[PDB]
Amino acid sequence: STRLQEDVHDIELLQYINVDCAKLKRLLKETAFKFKALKKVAQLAVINSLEKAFWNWVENYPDEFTKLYQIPQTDMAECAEKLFDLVDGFAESTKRKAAVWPLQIILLILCPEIIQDISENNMNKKLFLDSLRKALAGHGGSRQLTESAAIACVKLCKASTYINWEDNSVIFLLVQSMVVDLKNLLFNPSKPFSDVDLMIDCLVSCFRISPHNNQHFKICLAQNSPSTFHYVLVNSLHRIITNSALDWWPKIDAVYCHSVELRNMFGETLHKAVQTRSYKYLLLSMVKLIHADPKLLLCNPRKQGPETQGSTAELITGLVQLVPQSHMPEIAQEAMEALLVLHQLDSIDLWNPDAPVETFWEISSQMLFYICKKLTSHQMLSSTEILKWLREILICRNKFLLKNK
Numbered sequence: 001s002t003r004l005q006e007d008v009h010d011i012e013l014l015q016y017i018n019v020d021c022a023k024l025k026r027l028l029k030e031t032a033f034k035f036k037a038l039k040k041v042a043q044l045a046v047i048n049s050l051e052k053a054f055w056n057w058v059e060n061y062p063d064e065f066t067k068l069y070q071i072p073q074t075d076m077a078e079c080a081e082k083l084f085d086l087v088d089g090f091a092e093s094t095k096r097k098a099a100v101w102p103l104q105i106i107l108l109i110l111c112p113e114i115i116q117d118i119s120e121n122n123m124n125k126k127l128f129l130d131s132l133r134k135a136l137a138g139h140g141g142s143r144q145l146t147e148s149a150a151i152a153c154v155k156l157c158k159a160s161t162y163i164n165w166e167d168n169s170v171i172f173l174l175v176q177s178m179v180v181d182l183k184n185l186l187f188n189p190s191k192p193f194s195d196v197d198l199m200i201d202c203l204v205s206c207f208r209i210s211p212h213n214n215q216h217f218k219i220c221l222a223q224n225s226p227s228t229f230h231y232v233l234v235n236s237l238h239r240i241i242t243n244s245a246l247d248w249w250p251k252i253d254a255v256y257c258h259s260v261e262l263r264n265m266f267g268e269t270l271h272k273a274v275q276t277r278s279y280k281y282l283l284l285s286m287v288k289l290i291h292a293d294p295k296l297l298l299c300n301p302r303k304q305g306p307e308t309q310g311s312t313a314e315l316i317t318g319l320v321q322l323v324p325q326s327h328m329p330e331i332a333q334e335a336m337e338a339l340l341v342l343h344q345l346d347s348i349d350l351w352n353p354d355a356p357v358e359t360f361w362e363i364s365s366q367m368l369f370y371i372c373k374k375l376t377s378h379q380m381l382s383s384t385e386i387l388k389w390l391r392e393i394l395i396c397r398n399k400f401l402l403k404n405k
Contacts, residue, residue: 317366
């Protein structure tokens with residue numbers, strides 16, 4: 001407050017404060033009354049600090065954000081209209097404008113009442129929203145304007161993710177106007193975007209809002225020409241596997257029917273594992289996903305039977321080929337713990353759904369002899385970590401032999 005009374009870094013302190021509704025009430029009141037007329041860049045510091053503070057509130061207390069829409073609250077409406085008038089008074093140049101709409105979206109979402117009023121104060125709101133829509137159209141807009149529209153849409157839909165649609169029907173009435181536009185500029189296969197975090201968050205949110213099979217999910221999935229789109233896909237899938245906590249329960253552990261294609265994609269870059277720069281990051285992200293969850297690539301039976309080349313066997317032979325490699329340490333490092341997680345009993349229940357007893361000893365002897373011949377080759381620099389991991393593999397094998405009886 002003393003900082004706000006009059007090179008300003010104490011504002012960013014509220015970027016790191018644990019806040020609730022009552023704290024943002026008094027904080028947003030203090031930035032509302034004084035409104036800091038006498039500076040320019042500290043206004044932007046206040047603006048993006050309020051952005052990160054709003055996000056901190058909505059992960060910390062999602063129930064308050066749900067009850068904001070379930071029961072209307074008027075102090076948020078009047079304070080948000082006050083700050084919207086202040087922000088609209090602040091920005092006239094296109095740079096400051098393209099800065100401020102990532103807060104104008106939040107400041108509009110904070111009001112449940114006036115979103116239906118969009119469909120004296122209303123004309124500025126309608127004009128700025130339609131200015132965002134024209135930037136989404138891509139024509140009649142600045143180069144920084146279209147990027148800011150995409151940031152506005154991804155933050156808007158991420159705000160829309162948390163609340164249920166049965167709480168309010170106005171949220172899909174908003175976002176379904178913009179889903180086709182965001183898909184058009186974001187997830188087209190031909191033209192590159194104006195990065196990767198925006199597509200990851202956009203993809204995660206667009207199958208929060210849709211439990212159906214997304215055609216754009218097929219676009220980034222099946223042999224898309226941008227390999228960065230595949231990186232976005234695998235990283236977003238890792239976000240689904242790891243980072244779900246009160247997030248919307250459709251589309252987790254529900255994309256398993258695509259799973260064998262993912263293994264096929266692995267096989268493609270497995271050949272690119274043999275012999276560029278973007279290839280190894282994609283490999284590292286996929287093997288992080290395997291270490292995070294191996295049940296995705298094992299729940300599909302995947303032509304079980306040794307007459308066909310076993311897909312589980314193909315994957316594990318690819319991993320154990322990737323283990324004793326010294327051209328890159330980090331990729332070989334991650335597959336090591338991926339294998340030792342894979343050798344746990346719950347993982348090897350999914351190894352052979354027909355009979356888990358049969359092929360586990362066979363493929364374990366296969367990887368055992370393959371790694372022991374490489375250790376006999378002796379031309380290693382870091383074979384002691386291989387020895388420790390092999391010791392853990394021996395522990396897991398003896399545990400499964402105890403369970404096998």
